Ligand binder design. Structure first.
Ligand SMILES: C[C@H]1COc2c(N3CC[C@@H](C4(N)CC4)C3)c(F)cc3cc(C(=O)O)c(=O)n1c23
Ligand SMILES: C[C@H]1COc2c(N3CC[C@@H](C4(N)CC4)C3)c(F)cc3cc(C(=O)O)c(=O)n1c23
Ligand SMILES: [Mg+2]
Ligand SMILES: [Mg+2]
Lengths: 706, 631
DNA sequence: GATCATACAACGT
DNA sequence: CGTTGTAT
DNA sequence: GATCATACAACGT
DNA sequence: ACGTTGTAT
């Protein structure tokens, strides 16, 4: 046990359930050991709603809580409750709420008596800590608390504001005054009313009910349209789990239709390009990579992010990897056999350019980061539909995503043929887009028509099957389905023999080596053994044939999650691509203009170098003089003053005139594409085919259409 | 069994077990091994020294116990029939302390498995380094194959104790791994201080590999440098925090990002090992003069190791650090490339005060240790100045100013005056403190000491001798001198040797500034010549083919001056921008003579050092906290 | 530096 | 016997 | 994102 | 009921 307390005043004693261990150690160093205890909650706790009393006591985290609380699971007896006020403090994440949401599930589904009397309490942690000299101010919301603290800035000096993104970042004494010391402590008393007792149980049910996931989908669809001291648990539970359910659906687990990436994925790819680790740069240690991702853009777990960067670098997890690394990046038999970040070096892959090349052409928005010191892109200018090329498989609260990867050349031609005939129907797209293209050579056996349903309804499943020959009578598997381990498939096919379920099999051998990636041999006892029939069993028994559910749920351009079909995904991406190039063009035009405007100002100086130099020496501020005596603009005048004497030579005049001829022609070409909607398309129809030419490859997974 | 990845075969004549050093290195060694006849077993961290451990104690260590179970033979058991593998090969990282992991493995294969190494079953794998240094855990799995696993291109040796070198293999290994025979290893270092063989001698490899580690730790891990008073793990952190812009005025940065840069750039060692060091610098109650400031939970006096993860804590350099880095940009110290050879790191740091005695250090090398207590700032400063003004000052005269140590606590030092006179005259000894708590003394540890006394003015006297109220502190003034070798020095020797370093780093600072001023003045001439004749310069630039030689011939300016002129901007032609140029000329002319006068006159040199050691102690002057009187 | 138990949707055995 | 701070 | 165990010197119990 | 799948504490 980690909780200690001296006094035994059932009305004064007080328990605090901190979220983190790092936070627990700080909360214990500053707590009042006289009548206050503290016990950390390593990681997230069990969802004790639909768990049996025997199971609640079988989970470490909930167990210790049940012992420290004093009461037994589902025991309406509080005669030996060690502490009076059982407080639950967690950090102000969307995550901590979830931690606070399921602690209520524990203190409700089992310890109903504890909350009925009103002993469950939630602490209000501070958001910001603004200070100026002998003045300390804490905030809970930047709209009301932080706004006033900064508004009353009529005192000398520049205030300092520390953004506490989590209680782990707080100092012991700095945490004592905010949530521990009752004087300066903010804390609300969670209570379940007697009249609202029927609703407090109904709300928490659909929120934490494993089976009522469909109800939550309709719940979030309704609460999203109209989204705008003692607290009632009825109110708390619904508001806390909503701020989480949305947070996960948006900023953790579901990707964006445009760039086909997740925020942890995006912030990782950008932070590598920003660190200079493009496809050509020499590899950099994965540590600094993840140090920058978390240190600047993604305030979450170190190990959790590097796990995402591993999958982006594995040629067998992604179809078109985004990262190339040096070191032990795992093996097909187990993707998680990978080395630490401190040992593995990484960089961006050639395919990553399709997401980053157009980043400097004002083709994307930009939102501040969590601390506000830097600037990160809200999305990335994808030049091909990455959402379909690599796919994703996520799990949000109320919904999930399962998008299989597809071939690059097959999607590109589908994008080209959809702008040449905007009336293209789905059946016409399937004549080119043939189906999922996994990073394996296993045949997709799902029927062609069954695929049409999957790409019209946005849901369904496809099944893969391994490839094999009968060299020398023995069967030899040559390639396995996606995400199927050879060691696992062999162990399954081996444990059967021990269970006497395959008395016709002689031996099983794994001949995988450098030349042959995955060679699995299966020898029968007699040549007269119907290995053709033996296999039809192993497909329906082992992982030699694995199904794959498809759920094309994604954040659409409209900022909302939705299940698109193949046509809606491509049609809606071309809206995204046609709009970024539109922005990519106007951006260059905006700079060509401003250049030609500088240049024409320079030529005026050359044609009047005598007067200019005379005005510079015979005037206090030359810029106003140069504008009245020549008609030039202030922006043009500044450039004149910045001309170096080197530039007054004749050659540099010829260079300036050289640009203005080149740029003048460039200016007209841009104005033409932007103005002509047909020229605009001809550009897209060209850039897409060009990208496929330099990044497309042959189809890995055949569809078994002979 | 254990985590050892066994092979499919069982032939005692063709099986082999590889004991890798790193677990991540073992994960890659398991992908690339031939699953038929090759088997690996990881060895997390360093193993226990079983040279002194008993037969039953050998089986207690979980690492050594698994090695025994995997090997087959039991500790000190004569029966060799139980041998699950034929070749017992060890694969350690080319790290110096990787050769230490190998030596410790030999201590068991000889003291407890003598018949195993005698029969010629202990083998050594020679790891190549070339691709960068490419550590074992860092290289590619397939790359690790062709270097240590694939027998075709594998480089391994056969360790065997010769019958003639048997008595020597035992006597040599003894003093190397004898916890008590530490003084013998000190004398061994003094007397002892690409070609390879296909079968080396265990006795010859035991004394060779343990000497590398014995020297690597004494130099690059444990002992500090006399000048900056820092170890490499400490020096690299300071530099990397400045190169990242974490100055005194900058905002705090997450320590995780800071440590990450220290490792990937300069310091190829443990991550928690680096963060633990940086906290020893940031805690105000471990260093008297901290080098790091931070936000969050940086420990508490009751338990320094109760601190928050590097991911939650954020830190920056402190004001006191400026004494080590202010003069780093004036070419004052030497520079050596980093370990991978892509960046450069400083060899020394331009210390403006003798940090070796201000903060002190506490290290444990091989054969020798280090115990330097911290000292007062205004005292070590007032001593250095008085040593310059009177080079013939004696330690007794020095003790009149430097009263003794200065610990970060108000507890009084009860050591006698004559006892301290022996500390600073011999370079060794101890010192004692008494509560009013002492340095490094926990408030919870002493209470439990007095509480156990309860279960089973004069009262305080008995509590000082029983509880931790009265503690002792060892003192050993060992350090790497400017001569690049370890040596124990005293106060009158340490201060004198430091002022040789300070009088050299400042001399380099002066000549570095002198070299820059003369270069600027040379430019300012060609510029003033242009303002005096700008009318011609413009005509020469617009009416001549190539102005660079033309401006040189006419005006007698040099190649560099004519280039500066061409780089003038039209706004630099107004009257002001010439007054601004005549301002430097008259300003830098004053400095060009002061420096030359301060560098050519050894008397003006000392006046600067004396004036600089005094002005620097002003802003950085904190009166001491620990009283000092006999008791 | 490598173990570890959780949430979450929802399809397969 | 346990102390200290860098190391695997 | 906390936790385990080792080295190594030499003084204090 | 079990086992995934992949970003989170
Ligand atoms: C929240 C902390 C600590 O708990 C974690 C895990 N456990 C295993 C034991 C279990 C427990 N409640 C009994 C102690 C929680 C775990 F398996 C993985 C992580 C990964 C990360 C990270 O990626 O940063 C991380 O921070 N934590 C983790
Ligand atoms: C060398 C590696 C792995 O082994 C380590 C430890 N153990 C756990 C018990 C002990 C053993 N003989 C039973 C296996 C070794 C340990 F306790 C700490 C670290 C810390 C760091 C680091 O700071 O990086 C580190 O790298 N390692 C560590
Ligand atoms: Mg948080
Ligand atoms: Mg190494």
């Amino acid at each position: 046990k980690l909780a200690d307390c001296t006094a035994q005043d059932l009305n004064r004693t007080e328990l605090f359930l901190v979220e983190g261990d790092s936070a627990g150690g700080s909360a214990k160093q500053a707590r009042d050991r006289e009548y206050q205890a503290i016990m950390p909650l390593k990681g997230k706790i069990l969802n004790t709603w639909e768990v049996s009393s025997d199971e609640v006591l079988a989970s470490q985290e909930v167990h210790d809580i049940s012992v420290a609380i004093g009461i037994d699971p589902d025991s309406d007896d509080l005669s030996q409750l060690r502490y009076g006020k059982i407080c639950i403090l967690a950090d102000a994440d969307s995550d901590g709420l979830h931690i606070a949401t399921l602690l209520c599930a524990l203190f409700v589904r089992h310890f109903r008596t504890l909350v009925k009397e009103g002993h469950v309490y939630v602490a209000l942690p501070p958001l910001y800590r603004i200070d100026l000299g002998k003045e300390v101010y804490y905030a809970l919301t930047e709209e009301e608390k932080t706004g006033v603290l900064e508004q009353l800035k009529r005192k000398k000096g520049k205030p300092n504001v520390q953004r506490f993104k989590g209680l782990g970042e707080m100092n012991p004494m700095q945490l004592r005054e905010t949530t521990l010391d009752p004087n300066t402590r903010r804390l609300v008393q969670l209570v379940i009313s007697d009249e609202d007792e029927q609703q407090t149980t109904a709300i928490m049910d659909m929120l934490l009910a494993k089976k009522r996931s469909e109800d939550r989908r309709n719940w979030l669809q309704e609460k999203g349209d109209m989204a705008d001291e003692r607290l009632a648990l009825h109110e708390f539970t619904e508001n806390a789990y909503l701020n989480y359910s949305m947070y996960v659906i948006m900023d953790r687990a579901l990707p964006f239709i445009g760039d086909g990436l997740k925020p942890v994925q995006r912030r990782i790819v950008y932070a590598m390009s920003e660190l200079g680790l493009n496809a050509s740069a020499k590899f950099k240690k994965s540590a600094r990579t993840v140090g920058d991702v978390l240190g600047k853009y993604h305030p979450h777990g170190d190990s959790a992010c590097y796990e995402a960067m591993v999958l982006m670098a594995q040629p067998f997890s992604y179809r078109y990897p985004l990262v190339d690394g040096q070191g032990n990046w795992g093996a097909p038999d187990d993707p998680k056999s990978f080395a630490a970040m401190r040992y593995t070096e990484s960089r961006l892959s050639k395919y990553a350019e399709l997401l980053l090349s157009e980043l400097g052409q004002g083709t994307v928005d930009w939102v501040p980061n969590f601390d506000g010191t830097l600037q990160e892109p809200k999305m990335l200018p994808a030049r091909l539909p990455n959402i379909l090329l690599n796919g994703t498989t996520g799990i949000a609260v109320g919904m999930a995503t399962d998008i299989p990867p597809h071939n690059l050349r097959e999607v590109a031609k589908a994008a080209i043929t959809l702008i040449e005939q905007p009336k293209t129907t789905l059946d016409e797209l399937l004549d080119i887009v043939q189906g999922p293209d996994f990073p394996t050579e296993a045949e997709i056996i799902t029927s062609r028509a069954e695929i049409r349903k999957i790409y019209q309804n946005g849901r369904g499943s496809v099944r893969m099957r391994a490839v094999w020959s009968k060299e020398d009578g023995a069967v030899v598997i040559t390639a396995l389905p996606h995400q199927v381990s050879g060691a696992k498939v062999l162990e399954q096919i081996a444990a059967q023999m021990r269970n006497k379920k395959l008395p016709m099999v002689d031996d099983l051998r794994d001949e995988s080596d450098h030349e042959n990636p995955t060679r699995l041999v299966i020898v029968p006892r007699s040549n007269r053994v119907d290995m053709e029939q033996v296999m039809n069993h192993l497909f329906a028994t082992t992982d030699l044939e694995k199904s794959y559910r498809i759920n094309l749920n994604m954040i659409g351009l409209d900022g909302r999650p939705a299940v698109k079909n193949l046509l809606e995904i491509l049609s809606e991406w071309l809206v995204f691509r046609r709009d970024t190039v539109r922005r990519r063009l106007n951006h260059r035009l905006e700079k060509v203009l401003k250049r030609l405007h500088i240049l024409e100002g320079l030529l005026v100086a050359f044609l009047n170098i005598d007067e200019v130099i005379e005005i510079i020496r015979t005037e206090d501020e030359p810029k106003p003089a140069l504008m009245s005596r020549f008609g030039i603009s202030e922006t043009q005048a500044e450039a004149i003053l910045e001309l170096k004497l080197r530039h007054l030579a004749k050659l540099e005049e010829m260079k300036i005139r050289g640009e203005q001829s080149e740029l003048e022609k460039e200016r007209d070409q841009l104005q033409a594409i932007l103005a002509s909607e047909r020229k605009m398309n001809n550009l897209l129809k060209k850039e897409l085919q060009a990208d496929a030419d330099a990044f497309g490859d042959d189809r890995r997974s055949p569809l078994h259409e002979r």
